């Protein structure tokens, strides 16, 4: 996997987690 | 190299080996002292005084004719400036840069250069304070600087 | 480069002390997380109760069923998988008996084909597996 797309997935995961923990 | 630039310039004065008054120079030590006194009364700094003594009077080095340096001569006579010449010129340059920056506020290069000039000013002031040339309470400010100029 | 000055002892010692934490062995042996996560709690052996017999499949290049046992340690109630070393030695073990279990020799690392198994059975029912294996001793009745 391209490293920048792994970074993008991690950032989307972090955003989803931020929505999880408000 | 340079303190605040990547340059590694080598240009500088290369003094001759001999420490003696040159043969062509007929001026006595007291005559050179009187010329220095007149030039200082005219309002010229030791650098300028030495320049015009070298360039028009044949005085290669005032130290080798008088036995004393020009700034020391002026201090002994008592007509030396309150703050040293290099520090005064640094403060003048900083004041000029600050006055430019007030009417040109988008000049980030001017801000960078002002930071460099003020760092040089602070280094010179710290040195002169350790040597007791400046009072220990002397500090450089962004408002009273133009008063000292 | 490194600082070579007569008054750089503090800086050198501090740099060494910070950089030691980037050594895996030093950080493992000086943090406490590894000690607290160690099922044996820092011991060399531990006694446990066999909960079941399991057959762990060897890693991909090899093909075999390694006979292991799920044992719950008496010291902390933690469940681990302990390899039963020799052949026919799983027959010496019965359910809910006490086994003395040691490490597998690699200090918390899996050994050989057996994946995720870091413990081996040394004794079963207070009799060594090697004494039962060679017929020197028989299972207590």
């Amino acid at each position: 996997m391209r490293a920048k797309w792994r970074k993008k997935r991690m950032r989307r995961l972090k955003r989803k987690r931020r929505k999880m923990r408000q | 190299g340079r303190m605040h630039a990547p340059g590694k310039g080598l240009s500088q004065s290369a003094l001759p080996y001999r420490r003696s008054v040159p043969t062509w120079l007929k001026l006595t030590s007291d005559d050179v002292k009187e010329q220095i006194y007149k030039l200082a009364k005219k309002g010229l700094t030791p650098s300028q005084i030495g320049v015009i003594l070298r360039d028009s009077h044949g005085v290669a080095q005032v130290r080798f004719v008088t036995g004393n340096k020009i700034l020391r001569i002026l201090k002994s006579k008592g007509l030396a400036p309150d703050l040293p010449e290099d520090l005064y010129h640094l403060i003048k340059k900083a004041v000029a840069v600050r006055k430019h920056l007030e009417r040109n506020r988008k000049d980030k290069d001017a801000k960078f250069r002002l930071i460099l000039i003020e760092s040089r000013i602070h280094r010179l002031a710290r040195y002169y304070k350790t040597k007791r040339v400046l009072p220990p309470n002397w500090k450089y400010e962004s408002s009273t600087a133009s008063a000292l100029v | 480069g490194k600082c070579r000055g007569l008054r750089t002892a503090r800086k050198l010692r501090s740099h060494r002390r910070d950089q030691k934490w980037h050594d895996k062995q030093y950080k493992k042996a000086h943090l406490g997380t590894a000690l607290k996560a160690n099922p044996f709690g820092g011991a060399s052996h531990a006694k446990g109760i066999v909960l079941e017999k399991v057959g762990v499949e060897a890693k991909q290049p090899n093909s075999a069923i390694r006979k292991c046992v799920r044992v719950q340690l008496i010291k902390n109630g933690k469940k681990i998988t302990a390899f039963v070393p020799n052949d026919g030695c799983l027959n010496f073990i019965e359910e809910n008996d006490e086994v003395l279990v040691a490490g597998f020799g690699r200090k918390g690392h899996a050994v050989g084909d057996i994946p995720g198994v870091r413990f081996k059975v040394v004794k079963v029912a207070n009799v060594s597996l090697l004494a039962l294996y060679k017929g020197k001793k028989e299972r207590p009745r």
Partner: protein, 129 residues
Amino acid sequence: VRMNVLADALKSINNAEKRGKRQVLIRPCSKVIVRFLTVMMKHGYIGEFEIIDDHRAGKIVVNLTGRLNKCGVISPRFDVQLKDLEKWQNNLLPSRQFGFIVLTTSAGIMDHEEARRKHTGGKILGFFF
């Protein structure tokens, strides 16, 4: 900037000796440099040298005899007692049959053998062999 003018001098001598040159220019000179060079000369490692006097700091033209393997400085100038001299000799010298560790002691600048003879420690300036 330039620090440890002795380090620069010894580096110049070493690099000139590696190149096979018969002479090397060392600048600036110093009392420590001259004393180190004299200690080098008494053991026959560099031969004669000349101090050019310019009216700010000296220069030294050192004739090079190709007997020098390595001349080095020890920075910082660790203070060495007579007990630690053997350890320093083992660390820095190629053999016990030759090679000298130069120390500055209260009796002057001299090799380690002369320091043992005078029964004094000091601060290690460098080595040559």
